[PDB]
Structures are given as C-alpha cells and as structure tokens.
Amino acid sequence: GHMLDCKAVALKWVHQFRIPGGDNCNFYCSYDSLYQQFNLWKKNDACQGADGFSTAIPKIQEAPCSDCPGSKTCICSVQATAWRVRNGKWFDGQQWFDCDVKPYTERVLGRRWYDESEADKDIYVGYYSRGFISNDNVHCGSQ
Ligand SMILES: [Zn+2]
Ligand SMILES: [Zn+2]
Ligand SMILES: [Zn+2]
Ligand SMILES: [Zn+2]
C-alpha cells in the first residue's frame, strides 16, 4: 500500500536575545553554531516518516531596541523542512503520540512552540520554536 496522509512541516529554532548597542549580532551567533543546533534536533520521532529533513538555513537578524537601555535585539535562527510527518494521533506499539505541529515541533526542537500569528517582538522567552504545515497529503514513505 501507500499512506497518502502525511504532511511536510516547516520548522524553525529561534534564539532571541539582547546585546550591547555597540556590538553586532554576528559576534554572538555563527552559521556554524546554528548548524550544530540543527544537528541536535530529534530525527527519529515516532511521527517521523521517510526522507528526513531538508538542508538547514541559518539566519541572523539585528535591530536597535527602542524599549531597551541602548541594546540591540538579536534573532538567531535555523530553519529546515521535515519532508514527511504523520497526521493525527499515532500509536507506536506501546503508546500514543500527538502528531499535530505544536506537540511535534516541541518534541523535535525541544523548545516551546509559538504560532506564526505571534510576532518575534511579542515573544519574551529567549528560546522558542516555530512549526507549520508547508505541504499536506504527501506519501509517508520515500516511494
Ligand atoms: Zn508511497
Ligand atoms: Zn507511502
Ligand atoms: Zn544563542
Ligand atoms: Zn544562537
């Protein structure tokens, strides 16, 4: 057979922090360190289908913070797509797993998930995750 009820999930690991206004965000974050955060994502979750994850894309963002005492806001992130993820609830033989994007993202990235409707400027925890459906109704297997 074929299981045609899997989804592709766009995932993003975020570190948002403040730095002194005379510094640059690239003194704190590197493409190398963000790639190593990606390597720490769980790649064998019970909800994971075949074909693993896309190439990770590191990103560094900087802006002066109006509300801070002379500080800049740094947003260091690494994004990738989980090509094939199960839909619904999944029984692995011993227990149930919720394969919804929020609980799936939190298990795989290990940080609290926030809906894309909540902007980075309205999130006050330092480490968090993003996850949303980028493709629905894909095969769960690689064929
Ligand atoms: Zn198939
Ligand atoms: Zn299949
Ligand atoms: Zn960091
Ligand atoms: Zn970082």
Numbering used by the authors: -2 to 140
The authors write:
The Dothideomycete Leptosphaeria maculans, causal agent of oilseed rape stem canker or blackleg disease, is one of the fungal pathogens in which suppression of ETI by the presence of an AVR gene has been demonstrated. Among them, AvrLm4-7 suppresses Rlm3-mediated resistance triggered by AvrLm3 and Rlm9-mediated resistance triggered by AvrLm5-9. Surprisingly, despite low sequence similarity, AvrLm5-9 and AvrLm3 are structural analogues of AvrLm4-7, sharing an anti-parallel β-sheet covered by α-helices. Structure-informed sequence database searches identified a larger number of putative structural analogues among L. maculans effector candidates, including the AVR effector AvrLmS-Lep2, all produced during the early stages of oilseed rape infection, as well as among effector candidates from other phytopathogenic fungi. These structural analogues are named LARS (for Leptosphaeria AviRulence and Suppressing) effectors.
A small secreted protein with 37% amino acid sequence identity with AvrLm3 was identified from F. fulva. The analysis of the anomalous signal revealed the presence of two Zn-clusters in the structure that resemble those of the Ni-ions in AvrLm5-9. One Zn-cluster is bound near the N- and C-termini and involves histidines from the native protein and from the linker peptide and side chains from a crystal neighbor. Strands β1 and β2 are connected by a peptide composed of a helical turn and a short helix surrounded by irregular peptides. The long connection between strands β3 and β4 contains a β-hairpin, a short helix and some irregular peptide stretches. The sequence alignment and structure superposition show conservation of all 10 cysteines, suggesting both proteins form an identical set of disulfide bridges. The sequence similarities between AvrLm5-9, AvrLm4-7 and Ecp11-1/AvrLm3 are relatively weak (between 18 and 28%). Nevertheless, the 3D structures of all these effectors are strongly related: AvrLm5-9 and Ecp11-1/AvrLm3 share the same fold with AvrLm4-7, which displays suppressive interactions with AvrLm5-9 and AvrLm3. All three effectors have a disulfide bridge that connects the N- and C-termini, and also at least one disulfide bridge that links the helical connection between β1-β2 and strand β3.
